[PDB]
Write an enzyme that holds these catalytic residues in place. Structure first.
Site, PDB file in Angstrom:
ATOM      1  N   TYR A 141       0.772  -1.059   0.045  1.00 58.04           N
ATOM      2  CA  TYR A 141       0.013  -0.085  -0.010  1.00 58.04           C
ATOM      3  C   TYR A 141       0.790   1.410  -0.032  1.00 58.04           C
ATOM      4  O   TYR A 141       0.290   2.498  -0.446  1.00 58.04           O
ATOM      5  CB  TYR A 141      -1.125  -0.058   1.241  1.00 58.04           C
ATOM      6  CG  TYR A 141      -2.139  -1.017   1.233  1.00 58.04           C
ATOM      7  CD1 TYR A 141      -2.235  -1.719   0.015  1.00 58.04           C
ATOM      8  CD2 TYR A 141      -2.947  -1.237   2.226  1.00 58.04           C
ATOM      9  CE1 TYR A 141      -3.293  -2.420  -0.190  1.00 58.04           C
ATOM     10  CE2 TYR A 141      -3.844  -2.221   2.273  1.00 58.04           C
ATOM     11  CZ  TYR A 141      -4.127  -3.058   1.253  1.00 58.04           C
ATOM     12  OH  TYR A 141      -5.333  -4.064   1.016  1.00 58.04           O
ATOM     13  N   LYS A 192       2.867 -15.627   2.106  1.00 58.89           N
ATOM     14  CA  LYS A 192       2.820 -16.343   1.073  1.00 58.89           C
ATOM     15  C   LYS A 192       4.180 -17.007   0.775  1.00 58.89           C
ATOM     16  O   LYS A 192       4.710 -16.802  -0.492  1.00 58.89           O
ATOM     17  CB  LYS A 192       2.399 -15.553  -0.234  1.00 58.89           C
ATOM     18  CG  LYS A 192       1.085 -15.954  -1.004  1.00 58.89           C
ATOM     19  CD  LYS A 192       1.232 -17.637  -1.076  1.00 58.89           C
ATOM     20  CE  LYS A 192       0.225 -17.826  -2.267  1.00 58.89           C
ATOM     21  NZ  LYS A 192      -0.104 -19.213  -2.269  1.00 58.89           N
ATOM     22  N   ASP A 224      -3.740 -18.007   1.382  1.00 63.91           N
ATOM     23  CA  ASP A 224      -4.964 -18.708   0.963  1.00 63.91           C
ATOM     24  C   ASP A 224      -5.408 -19.654   1.909  1.00 63.91           C
ATOM     25  O   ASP A 224      -6.771 -19.659   1.858  1.00 63.91           O
ATOM     26  CB  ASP A 224      -4.636 -19.249  -0.605  1.00 63.91           C
ATOM     27  CG  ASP A 224      -3.110 -20.033  -0.643  1.00 63.91           C
ATOM     28  OD1 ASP A 224      -2.035 -19.270  -0.107  1.00 63.91           O
ATOM     29  OD2 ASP A 224      -3.230 -20.881  -1.274  1.00 63.91           O
ATOM     30  N   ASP A 248      -5.332  -6.821   5.778  1.00 62.94           N
ATOM     31  CA  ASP A 248      -6.741  -6.085   5.234  1.00 62.94           C
ATOM     32  C   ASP A 248      -7.944  -7.012   4.813  1.00 62.94           C
ATOM     33  O   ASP A 248      -8.914  -7.017   5.454  1.00 62.94           O
ATOM     34  CB  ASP A 248      -6.403  -5.105   4.065  1.00 62.94           C
ATOM     35  CG  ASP A 248      -7.672  -3.989   3.717  1.00 62.94           C
ATOM     36  OD1 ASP A 248      -8.431  -3.986   4.670  1.00 62.94           O
ATOM     37  OD2 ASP A 248      -7.485  -3.703   2.538  1.00 62.94           O
ATOM     38  N   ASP A 252     -11.026  -8.098   7.355  1.00 66.79           N
ATOM     39  CA  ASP A 252     -12.466  -8.133   6.764  1.00 66.79           C
ATOM     40  C   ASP A 252     -13.243  -9.545   6.742  1.00 66.79           C
ATOM     41  O   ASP A 252     -14.372  -9.427   7.231  1.00 66.79           O
ATOM     42  CB  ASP A 252     -12.463  -7.388   5.428  1.00 66.79           C
ATOM     43  CG  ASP A 252     -12.336  -5.871   5.626  1.00 66.79           C
ATOM     44  OD1 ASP A 252     -12.163  -5.465   6.727  1.00 66.79           O
ATOM     45  OD2 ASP A 252     -12.449  -5.319   4.694  1.00 66.79           O
TER      46      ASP A 252
END
Lengths: 358, 358
Positions: A141, A192, A224, A248, A252
């Protein structure tokens, strides 16, 4: 014992809910012999209308000098069409950067009284109680280089850079470790690492810190798989630490799994200095002024403030307990209203919580 | 009408399940006046033991010259300690690159007979039927520059590049639009355009292609909100198109929401050329040879082969219908068994599906 607290009412329902949380924080503090010095400052839409920018330097100063910051909400119809740099949201990003709160803590718990709000079956949702610790001020970000360039072949190419330095991973991990100690001592690091070099470094640094926190049970999980495990068996999780983008997304997901977004608090912590505490819900422009808002998330955010901000347990417990008592007595605002419960407005819900705190 | 099909049995339960899908494919096709020439080639662990590498050139040749490729599974305990370039998984990545199958189609549907396998409540899970179209061969998983470097301070920095060129976004989107036409005509493009320049370009290109597919209802959604929406109301989705990393995450989430991973097929498609069809489950080394594997995912992958690979809609329906009939008859392998059903082995489940096809 006096603390200084900066209040950032902000926009929409923000002021309504911050005001109630203030009073709740004050009463619960008082019972534990803790007093507060409150100062309200502008941010977001309100700062735009008043000063012309989303975060006036005076607000940064007050926040930096105080012991903790409690924020309502940011955003609204009026400012949606502003240049990006002058949008309310930009003020949130700026205050986080100014306070150096690189650690976002979002507890996702399913409350016994609200189990049915979740789309997960009861036996799966009941007793869910996890904490996502998300790296907040770095990662893709904010990574460089970034942009949209045209490659002289006439074709546009868009790019962003997921990047972390070792010291950035170390500090978010330490917070996560310290956070697991305040819970059930189980930490799951999510990345990851089977594909991304940045995740490989992430995993290396977290893995190396384990020996410094041998009391904590560390595990690792691919992002994942974590997205699947949240759906399959979210009760397995205590604390999760992860980067900005994965955090993020997974936070959520976990929030929606609990079922009641209007009940969820958050804390953003730095190494030293005051933290920033706010509900995860937005400013809800639609119900502003209508006495419909759910104040429980901001109240619970004031509880996180006491616990993770000021190290004032007990005072924090009083808040958490009073929220439970209110729910136990059947009180519900619109967003959590259920067949057979007592529908109430924001004000009245505040009053019921205050009443329990005594 | 005669097709050539390359079979890549692969590892663990791979051979078992591909063998059954082969015959199911043969019968369903025969009913539609379609014959096949099958040729088995080595990949993964099997290719390592036989030829020395995870993907021999001959296998690439055969695959490229065929009309479609049906793959079983890749991976096993024996090769887990191999150097990265010689792991079975490398063979999957290599064959995808060789065939230029940039589009991964994964349908997540909840079958009426298997609704209770989902951790979502029945009324939420029932009728879920979505397709994740995920960019498969670009994005941050293959982006340059990448690495772990040591900066002047002796501190390590880990980085990866999320990058797409316009033409890479165009082609995955076109496949997605085409895919929605074969379903319910609704396409949701998922990105992070509110923060990432790469997602801004993504959204711009998808948005511009809309006029070229005026019949399709296009919408856009942020990846974090999509993770919540899959939990709150997965029935809202028809087709989703997204990049490699978000597609990987959101598809896994969607898969777990269905409740039965062993039922889920996949298709990887190119611009022109044979596609690669494969069950999303792994090689299940633990149950290999014990006659326990669920062949339905590979069978349903053969159905995808017929539909998305060869445009043989009728033959594909015969397969989908027979799978339903078998389940209606109460047949279940271990992974999908529940109270009151007929527990069966892999072979026998194959036999029931074949019976229904005739």
């Amino acid at each position: 014992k006096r603390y200084t607290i900066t209040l950032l009412p902000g926009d929409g329902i923000g002021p309504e809910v911050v005001s109630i949380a203030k009073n709740v924080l004050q009463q619960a503090g008082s019972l534990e012999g803790v007093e507060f010095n409150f100062r309200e400052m502008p941010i977001g839409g309100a700062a735009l209308d008043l000063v012309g920018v989303p975060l006036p330097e005076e607000t940064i100063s007050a926040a930096k000098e105080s012991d903790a910051v409690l924020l309502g909400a940011i955003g609204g119809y009026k400012w949606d069409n502003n240049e990006k740099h002058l949008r309310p949201e930009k003020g949130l990003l700026q205050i986080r950067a100014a306070l150096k709160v690189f650690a976002n803590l979002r507890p996702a718990t399913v409350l016994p009284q609200l189990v049915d709000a979740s789309t997960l079956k009861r036996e799966v949702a009941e007793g869910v109680d996890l904490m996502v610790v998300r790296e907040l001020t770095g990662g893709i970000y904010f990574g460089e280089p970034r942009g949209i360039k045209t490659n002289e072949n006439g074709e546009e190419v868009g790019f962003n850079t997921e990047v972390y330095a070792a010291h950035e991973i170390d500090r978010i991990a330490r917070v996560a470790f310290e956070t697991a100690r305040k819970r059930r001592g189980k930490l799951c690091s999510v990345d990851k690492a089977n594909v991304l070099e940045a995740s490989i470094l992430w995993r290396k640094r977290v893995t190396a810190l384990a020996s410094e926190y041998p009391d904590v049970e560390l595990s690792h999980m691919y992002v994942d798989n974590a997205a699947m495990q949240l759906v399959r068996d979210p009760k397995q999780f205590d604390t999760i630490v992860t980067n900005n983008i994965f955090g993020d997304i997974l936070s959520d997901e976990a929030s929606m799994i609990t079922g009641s977004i209007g009940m969820l608090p958050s804390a953003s912590l730095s190494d030293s200095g005051p933290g920033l505490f706010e509900p995860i819900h937005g400013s809800a422009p639609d119900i502003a002024g209508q006495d419909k808002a759910n104040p429980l998330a901001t109240i619970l955010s004031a509880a996180m403030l006491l616990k993770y901000g000021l190290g004032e347990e007990k005072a924090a417990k009083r808040i958490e307990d009073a929220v439970l008592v209110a729910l136990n007595n059947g009180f519900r605002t619109g967003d959590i209203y259920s067949a057979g419960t007592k529908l109430v407005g924001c004000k009245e819900m505040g009053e019921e919580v205050l009443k329990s705190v005594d």
